[PDB]
């Protein structure tokens, strides 16, 4: 029965102090996870035109840049290897190579910065000639259970390299449980699995596929037989429920802003650690507008606050350093 | 979600600080902290309080000195509690609405000097009555409801005139929020916030505040046994126009905080009262508990859903948080 | 649509009789469980400076004091042995020694007072040199499943001694199910398991670690890799759900006052027998204030009524005798 | 929570008295018990009631004698039911508001003598009408709603003037709670509680009370079939200002108690009516049921969510509880 | 926002037609199940003083009386044998005797009235010398799992006799699942199990124990280690959930009127076929009052309507014939 | 509840008629059936309706003849629909409130003769307007809301004066329930029930009724697409004082019935409209469906939560139920 003029919702908005007192959500640097593109080789830095301000870095350069991310208090990185063209195959075997970019980078960072969280990407897409997330059958379909076998091998290799978190981004059915049972069997008791539970078949991923070099491989291919239809919301709940039952420690929605309603439903329904990826296309859209002078730089913290408001525990964001810098000030 | 060991091991996210930080559900910040402060009549005076180790009654000039650091630390607001000279107490509680009473003077001083600092005044007769009850007594010793409201209304208007951004009725009369709000609106004070003490219990935990300000209540304060009743109290105060609602005491009533936040989704505050402070500080000084119990106690309120916390630990907490 | 002045919530507060009629919760002595510190030896009584008014008692002295607890109608005791320094080890073997303090005390009390409930503590912390609740690996981490093996042995020894309730306070994952399956297999059909389900990594435990003599062992060590983060509420629901699925008969939240919101959520969510521990630091805070004249002794029953109000079925409290005495009057 | 045998054996907590006590969800206490009592016009008189074995109509002086033990036992309140002399009945029910009617006299006597004892008066015309209906009849024999309310209002004010702390309208007219509350407020009786009989059914279980007080109703009392309707009845009475709400009869309507408590979280009472008492006592005296069924019947009400219970067993129960 | 005088709840009560239009529940004879006490022998009829108007009947007499119950459209009977004293034993073997009263009566009635439902009682109490529902251990405790073994045998014997429904009234943990697995294994695919799920340790059963002749056996014994505490409501939900998971087709609350809040919660929570027993003490109380002229006979249909209102699908009631007769008129 | 085959076989309870009867969730009875009837102006006249096979428009004397059997069968109420002579139609719809209009005459006749039979009158202008819209038209052809209400109010009062126990506004003007209820209360008709057609859709299923009574509406009747909107319609009608609420059409809107019952727990009715009847009867007469589809259709409404059903099958159903 709250009614104007007895209730005037502007009163608490009248002054900064009262806005601070009634503020429902506060972003902190504990919320930020930085994705990073990792090159092979030494002393390599490469700009990405469709992700202004982000560079692909060789491992040596990554370790230098990480000093600052650690100093800013960024809790974790999510690694994305930029696989050389020659290491792509039909069998995706590079995925489980102990000397692959991801495994080498993990061992280097685990050594150098023991408190920094490392989240490796469990997916075959960086490793396939065709750019799909799994192994194809003779009809061109991404086979579910054969792909899981490879994913398992990959996840184990990551655990062996020391990754504290493996994040399967593949959208195969059942892979969380398969990976978890493999980790348990092998004694990797405490390796976290951060499931990409509700990962949509989106147009927002284009810049990332440029950054990692899978755009050329995928071409005009699509992923509608495994990634979720953008139209579907209830389905995301079923996806998350399975992954929690299968042993996920964290669950993720991807993409992010375009799916904030999904974040809120998933947090409300399961009350579990819930993450969201502000993907490459989201970063690119915002950057582009900022550098054109169309949007003020304040939009960065507004975009991130939205995820917090929608119920996210943490956010994978290419803005993590920028944001950490602003928050610290 | 059919989560089962060993597929689900809840300790995995606990393994490392980074993952604990990622999955952490609540983070206290200085934005959460409101400092109560006991205000004396004089100049260049401070007094120690036997039952509130570490807390000083401060004359207004001393308040303004300390307020420098409070503001520097980012503490958003203060809650003022005047220490009324005994000569100013009466059966009619008229001192409550004296334009040059302590609270009014303190408010004007602080408003002018630290314009961004929130000032929350106490609307209650208890510092002004010779008997220390929160309202006016009838011949049987009963606290009169509606008679008391009339005084409280004049009080609240006097605070608005002094410049308070928030008035906080702590009296537990029925209907007082509506009466106060209708008086503020009619006077043109359309942005003065009302922070209702909605679910304020008849508690043993207030002993030390009575030492601090120099002052039974079961016919107006709530029975500690009752939880559902708190929801009806809050409902009425929101309908009557409260901008924020408060539970008092605090840690002994964390269940009430959570139910109030869950039920109404409105700005909800909690008071970590004098006895809660005293217990904690006493145990800390005795060496029985680590200093860490201060931030743990305050994290509890955030976890229970509080938007902000009235706490005598506000400065110490703000300091620790800034490290 | 209840509105002043038609609705005046003070009317029922006007008189004692009406306050009694509308009172939502009434504490009784059926709510009180007394923790007690048990020494080895004979005719031993020791004060604890950080728990004024509580004594550690040898078994003979415990049996004498128990006559009065039984007379007051206190339903159960929770036993906490004060392990001699020389019986602490890396392997915690004393935990399952049939001639350990807990097992001896249980057999004595089961004999002397057959109707009195005995709740033994299932944890390795009193028995380890390092004071952690489980067995350490070579990185200093408390190993989950190896610790459970010891806990199991301990629980069985307690059942063998006649304890009606075993209460695992260890916070290892899965231990309720492991203990339950062991009890069932061994024919201990009716031994209750009172899980410490939501047990937080708290500062409020200091006096107890003084009382049992584990403070020196633990030193500055912490338990954040197993006990819960104070910040977390939803997580407590997941903890409780697992322990009910695993066969707990009762579930507990610890500490108590600082976590009353957890008590209420757990009762509301599961509608199961829910207990709360008013821990040593809580007792010490209140006692200290009472003996300084800062708080009236009425605070004791107010503190206990809060647990009842928050939904607790029973309360582990060092005030149990004091409170029983007051209630009886 | 996926609880499954044999990991979960619900009998474990049942194994021992101590564990049954630990997990026990509800405990009846004397605080729950309100004693109805039938009050005669005379002096030094008691009468037995054929259909309520063990229950005596009591003149006021005898009431005051018995009230000593009731108070000693801790029984919080009585609910008075006058046994009106036939010569005082009329079509206008004016005896209802007679300042020296039985209920008014009894109230004043008890208020003065046992000031802490709660007195709940019955607001209804049925003891005062020649026809025994709860309201005034029109020419077709229909109980007039609004005309009846006017009488009930005068009745309730007469009880407030006599000192009753609680008035309990048992008439089942629409809107009567609001009318009564607006009359009490306007007269200054701001703390007189109203215990509404909110969901009172058209029941066969009232036969023995009509023998007791010396007196069909389907156009005002509720149809036993209806559950949802009870929620609408209660909702209106809370909005109209009831301090407590009541379901009557009691055990045959335990489902309604539970729904009412769950829906509104308000102070909820239940009447274990004359027929419920008579059935139980008859079976106990016949040797067909053990005396233990008294406390079992009353435990049912607590379990269903009742705050308090109007029961003719109140003294026997209080005695058993005190052992 | 419904408010007087716009809303006057009496308007629909003004006339019979409108009361009928808004009436929420209507009892019908499809709701009534008749319990019946069965004697051994021929041409035997015995009154029961504590259940006025009810007779124990030998099988021949039962078949005669059943013609009228069938004609009235009573859907089912619940049989309760009156076991001869000499057939009571420690092992309860009479429970599974193919020539026991229950098995003989079932075969007779299945033959004579093929459409009439027969619900047999699965419990050891009619068959034990001590009157407890199960087999005692050497401490006098009713053993759970050993009792189930006997119950299983009994249930199978009933299925063999042709009973369409077996109703375990024993309150052993897990017995629904054990019985169901036995029935399935033996090919009794369609034998229904009507679980007494929430059966309370009540004083209301005295007349029945007179009627079946177990009062003398039980004496002053109690059943608090298996039947539910009257105080407990949430516990009933846990009891029902287990029995549905274990394969019950119907669930029952007993006693009835004193537990109507339980009926409503169970229906609301599970939305499953829910039954309630108006027990012997309930019948006796009402009869006694009716025959004393204290209550009108209308109380019978009022009592039964309450069960319907509280959500019961059907009611076990000794008033079934009386009520069927009234409804038919 | 983790129920799983083969431990759970849902067919077990289906095995036998007795167990199907035990577990049956809903039972239709004659108490559920309200018969709509088309009433002609004359004497000794009946007319057949091409699009409603089997249904006869009846003059009042013929209505009274048939009402004998309806009452004998236990049918609780009728809903009257007059067949207005074309000469009595107008732009102002004044015939609606004519004291000797068909509906008024029929009501008085039936009230006097069958005093226990409920009579539900139709409050709408559509039988009285030359254009057949449910309200008064403006110059653009729009149905005026508030102007129309004034007419409907006079109509409803005329029905109350004639003795109708229930008036049923079928017009879908906003606010009409409140206006009607305030007029009935002010006139002293305090027990006249209002059966609101709350969620009445702009439907193709009404074609045959327009043939029957001898008469687009998307600016007042609801869009068939909308479900949530029905809840807002019902909410308003309950607040405005409706005693019962109705969904129309019926089977095509069973989802709405269920949501309305679940949301409000109030007396909820449904109209199995002319087109639903015609479809069913046509298919039955063609031999395409068995007669059993009548009781199946009506069982659907009970299952969806309806308290009662307006259905042209009422007599046939009542007959079948009585066998
Ligand atoms: Cl936040
Ligand atoms: Cl690991
Ligand atoms: Cl209680
Ligand atoms: Cl055991
Ligand atoms: Cl029904
Ligand atoms: Cl079968
Ligand atoms: Mg998936
Ligand atoms: Mg959150
Ligand atoms: Mg976070
Ligand atoms: Mg100075
Ligand atoms: Mg209030
Ligand atoms: Mg919040
Ligand atoms: Mg805040
Ligand atoms: Mg756990
Ligand atoms: Mg409880
Ligand atoms: Mg308890
Ligand atoms: Mg005398
Ligand atoms: Mg009413
Ligand atoms: Mg309660
Ligand atoms: Mg009570
Ligand atoms: Mg069971
Ligand atoms: Mg039903
Ligand atoms: Mg049925
Ligand atoms: Mg004729
Ligand atoms: Mg409308
Ligand atoms: Mg219904
Ligand atoms: Mg109906
Ligand atoms: Zn991929
Ligand atoms: Zn005050
Ligand atoms: Zn431990
Ligand atoms: Zn009456
Ligand atoms: Zn039995
Ligand atoms: Zn119309």
Three-state SS string over chain A comes to: CCCCCCCCCCHHHCCHHHHHHHCCCCCCHHHEEEEEEEECCCCCEEECCCCCCCEEEEHHHHHHHHHHHHHCCCCEEEEEECCCHHHCECCCHHHHCCCCHHHHHHHHHHHHCCCCEEEEEECCCCCECCCCCCCECCCCCECHHHHHHHHHHHHHHHHHHCCCEEEECCCCCCHHHHHHHHHHHCCCCCCEEEEEEEEECCHHHHHHHHHHCCHHHHCCCCCCCCCECCCCCHHHHHHHHHHHHCCCCEEEEECCHHHHHHHHHHHHHHCCCEEEEECHHHHHHHHHHHHHCCCCCCHHHHHHHHHHHHCCCEEEECCHHHHHHHHHC
Written as six digits, the tokens of F32 are 């559920």
Query: What residue numbers of F does the annotated binding site for Mg(2+) cover?
Result: 233
Task: Give the separation between CA B54 and CA C38, rounded to whole angstroms.
Answer: 37
Q: Are E133 and E125 in contact (CB under 8 A)?
A: yes
Hey, which residues of D are catalytic here?
Answer: 200, 248
Pairing of strands B46-48, B56-59: antiparallel
Structural domain harbouring E172: 1-329
CATH of the domain at B1: 3.20.20.70
Helix (H, G, I), strand (E, B) or coil at E169: coil
Closest CA to E292 of D283, C42, C270, C57: D283
Q: Which of E238, E263, E306 sits opposite D252 (nearest CB)?
A: E306
Task: Give the separation between CA F234 and CA F228, rounded to whole angstroms.
Answer: 10
Angle of helix B102-113 relative to helix B60-72, nearest 10 degrees, comes to: 40
Task: Give the separation between CA E266 and CA C11, rounded to whole angstroms.
Answer: 36
The answer to whether A318 is annotated as binding is yes
Interface contact flag, B307 A22, Cβ < 8 Å: yes
Closest CA to D10 of C311, C244, C117: C244
Kindly state the DSSP code that residue B290 receives in the 8-state scheme: -
Closest CA to F71 of F27, F119, F106, F26: F119
> Do A and E make contact, counting contact as 3+ CB pairs within 8 angstroms?
no
Interface contact flag, E309 D25, Cβ < 8 Å: no
Written as six digits, the tokens of E145 are 């799992």
Of A87, A88, A254, A267, which one is the catalytic site residue? A254
Q: Which long-range contacts (CB under 8 A, 24 or more apart) does C60-69 make?
A: C62/C36, C62/C38, C62/C105, C62/C108, C62/C109, C63/C108, C63/C109, C63/C112, C66/C109, C66/C112, C66/C113, C66/C116, C68/C321, C69/C34, C69/C116, C69/C320, C69/C321, C69/C324
Closest CA to E244 of A192, B164, D5: D5
Interface contact flag, F267 E117, Cβ < 8 Å: no
Q: Are E128 and E88 in contact (CB under 8 A)?
A: yes
Interface contact flag, D232 F265, Cβ < 8 Å: yes
Written as six digits, the tokens of E298 are 């209308």
Report the domain count for chain A: 1
Q: Look at the block and give the residue holding tokens 């108490």.
A: F31
Closest CA to E106 of E71, E149, E76, E72: E76
Written as six digits, the tokens of C36 are 């007690």
Task: Give the separation between CA C131 and CA C213, rounded to whole angstroms.
Answer: 9
B225 neighbourhood in chain D, CB within 8 Å: none
Interface contact flag, C144 A189, Cβ < 8 Å: yes
User: Rounded to the nearest 10 degrees, how much is the dihedral formed by the CA atoms of B258, B259, B260, B263?
Assistant: 120
Kindly state the DSSP code that residue D252 receives in the 8-state scheme: G
Task: Give the separation between CA A46 and CA A35, rounded to whole angstroms.
Answer: 15
Beta bridge mates, F248: F200
Sequence-separated (6 or more) residues with CB below 8 Å from residue A174: A144, A145, A148, A242, A246
Residue ranges of the alpha helices (H) in D74-223?
Answer: 102-113, 145-162, 176-186, 207-213
Closest CA of chain E from C261, distance in Å: 20
Kindly state the DSSP code that residue D223 receives in the 8-state scheme: P
Task: Give the separation between CA F261 and CA F268, rounded to whole angstroms.
Answer: 6
Angle of helix A299-310 relative to helix A260-270, nearest 10 degrees, comes to: 30
| Helices and strands in chain C: count of H runs, count of E runs | 12, 10
Task: Give the separation between CA B318 and CA B70, rounded to whole angstroms.
Answer: 9
Q: Are A40 and A85 in contact (CB under 8 A)?
A: no
Classify residue E97 as left (phi > 0), alpha (psi -120 to 50) or beta: beta
Closest CA to A246 of A199, A200, A195, A198: A195
Closest CA to B18 of A282, C236, A241, A250: A250
Q: Are B174 and B134 in contact (CB under 8 A)?
A: no
User: What chains are in contact with F, requiring at least 3 Cβ pairs below 8 Å?
Assistant: D, E
CA pseudo-torsion sign A261, A264, A268, A274: positive
User: CA distances (Å), A264 to each of A232, A251, B20, B165, in order?
Assistant: 14, 13, 21, 34
Task: Give the separation between CA C172 and CA C226, rounded to whole angstroms.
Answer: 7
Query: What residue numbers of B does the annotated binding site for 5-aminolevulinate cover?
Result: 210, 217, 274, 312
Q: What are phi and psi of C220, to 5 degrees?
A: -90, 10
- Per DSSP (E only), the strands in chain B are 33-40, 46-48, 56-59, 77-82, 118-123, 166-169, 193-200, 244-248, 268-272, 308-311
Sequence-separated (6 or more) residues with CB below 8 Å from residue E181: F7
Give the distance between the most distant pair of CA atoms in chain A: 71
Task: Give the separation between CA A71 and CA B157, rounded to whole angstroms.
Answer: 51
Kindly state the DSSP code that residue E162 receives in the 8-state scheme: T
Task: Give the separation between CA A7 and CA D82, rounded to whole angstroms.
Answer: 49
| Resolution of the experimental model, in Å, one decimal | 1.6
Beta bridge mates, A58: A39
User: What chains are in contact with A, requiring at least 3 Cβ pairs below 8 Å?
Assistant: B, C
Task: Give the separation between CA D209 and CA D132, rounded to whole angstroms.
Answer: 12
B269 neighbourhood in chain A, CB within 8 Å: 21
Helix (H, G, I), strand (E, B) or coil at C300: helix
Q: Quick check: bond before C114 cis, omega within 30?
A: no
Task: Give the separation between CA A70 and CA C252, rounded to whole angstroms.
Answer: 38
The per-residue b/e assignment along F200-226, b for 16 or more CB within 10 angstroms, e otherwise, is: bbebebbebbeebbbbebeebbbeeee
**DSSP output for B120-155:** EEEE-STTTBTT--SS-B-TTS-B-HHHHHHHHHHH
Task: Give the separation between CA D27 and CA C73, rounded to whole angstroms.
Answer: 15
> Do A and D make contact, counting contact as 3+ CB pairs within 8 angstroms?
no
The per-residue b/e assignment along E200-227, b for 16 or more CB within 10 angstroms, e otherwise, is: bbbbbbbbbbbbbbbbebbeeeebebbb
Written as six digits, the tokens of A254 are 């991807």
Kindly report the number of other CB atoms within 10 A of residue B315's CB atom.
17
Written as six digits, the tokens of F259 are 């949501």
**DSSP output for D201-218:** B--GGGHHHHHHHT---T
Closest CA of chain B from D315, distance in Å: 25
Angle of helix B254-264 relative to helix C299-310, nearest 10 degrees, comes to: 40
Closest CA to E125 of E99, E102, E159: E102
Beta bridge mates, B248: B200
Task: Give the separation between CA F243 and CA E22, rounded to whole angstroms.
Answer: 10
Kindly report the number of other CB atoms within 10 A of residue E97's CB atom.
16
Hey, which residues of B are catalytic here?
Answer: 200, 248
How many Cα atoms sit within 13 Å of E198 on the Cβ side?
31
Q: Are F128 and F187 in contact (CB under 8 A)?
A: no
Task: Give the separation between CA B95 and CA B81, rounded to whole angstroms.
Answer: 14
Task: Give the separation between CA B85 and CA E213, rounded to whole angstroms.
Answer: 82
Give the distance between the most distant pair of CA atoms in chain B: 71
B35 C-alpha to center of ligand 13: Å?
14
For the purposes of burial, counting CB atoms within 10 Å of the CB of E114, is it exposed (0-12), middle (13-18) or buried (19 or more)?
Answer: exposed
Task: Give the separation between CA F4 and CA C107, rounded to whole angstroms.
Answer: 44
C265, containing H or E segment: helix C260-270
Task: Give the separation between CA B228 and CA B260, rounded to whole angstroms.
Answer: 10
- Alpha carbon D154 to chain centroid, angstroms: 21
Q: Look at the block and give the residue holding tokens 């006096």.
A: C207
Q: Are A277 and A318 in contact (CB under 8 A)?
A: no
Sequence-separated (6 or more) residues with CB below 8 Å from residue A40: A58, A82, A84, A101
Task: Give the separation between CA B62 and CA B56, rounded to whole angstroms.
Answer: 10
**CA triple C265-C267-C271, angle to 5 deg:** 135
How many Cα atoms sit within 13 Å of E273 on the Cβ side?
23
Interface contact flag, B146 D2, Cβ < 8 Å: no
Task: Give the separation between CA A120 and CA A162, rounded to whole angstroms.
Answer: 10
Q: Look at the block and give the residue holding tokens 């149905």.
A: F143
């Amino acid at each position: 029965n709250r009614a104007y003029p007895y209730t005037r919702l502007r009163r608490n908005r009248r002054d900064d102090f009262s806005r601070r007192l009634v503020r429902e959500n506060v972003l902190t640097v504990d919320d930020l996870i930085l994705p990073v593109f990792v090159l092979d080789g030494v002393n390599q830095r490469e700009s990405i035109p469709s992700m202004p301000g982000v560079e692909r870095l060789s491992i040596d350069q990554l370790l230098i840049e990480a000093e600052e991310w650690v100093a800013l208090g960024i809790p974790a990185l999510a690694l994305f290897p930029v696989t050389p063209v020659e290491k792509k195959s039909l069998d995706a075997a590079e995925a489980y190579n102990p000397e692959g970019i991801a495994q080498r980078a993990t061992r280097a960072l685990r050594e150098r910065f023991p408190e920094l969280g490392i989240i490796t990407d469990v997916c075959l897409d960086p490793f396939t000639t065709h750019g799909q997330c799994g192994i194809l059958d003779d009809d061109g379909y991404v086979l579910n259970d054969v792909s899981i076998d490879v994913l398992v091998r990959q996840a184990l290799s990551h655990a062996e390299a020391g990754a504290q978190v493996v994040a399967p981004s593949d959208m195969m059915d059942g892979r969380i449980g398969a990976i978890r049972e493999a980790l348990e069997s092998a004694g990797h008791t405490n390796v976290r699995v951060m499931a990409y539970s509700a990962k949509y078949a989106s147009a927002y991923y284009g810049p990332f596929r440029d950054a990692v070099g899978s755009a050329s491989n995928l071409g005009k291919g699509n992923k509608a037989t495994y990634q979720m239809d953008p139209a579907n919301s209830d389905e995301a709940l079923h996806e998350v429920a399975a992954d929690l039952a299968e042993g996920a420690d964290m669950v993720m929605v991807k993409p992010g802003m375009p799916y904030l309603d999904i974040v809120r439903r998933v947090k409300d329904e399961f009350r579990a650690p819930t993450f969201v990826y502000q993907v490459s296309g989201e970063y690119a859209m915002h950057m582009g507008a900022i550098q054109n002078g169309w949007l003020a730089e304040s939009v960065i913290l507004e975009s991130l606050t939205a995820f917090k408001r929608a119920g996210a525990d943490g956010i994978l964001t290419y803005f993590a350093k920028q944001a950490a810098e602003q928050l610290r000030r």
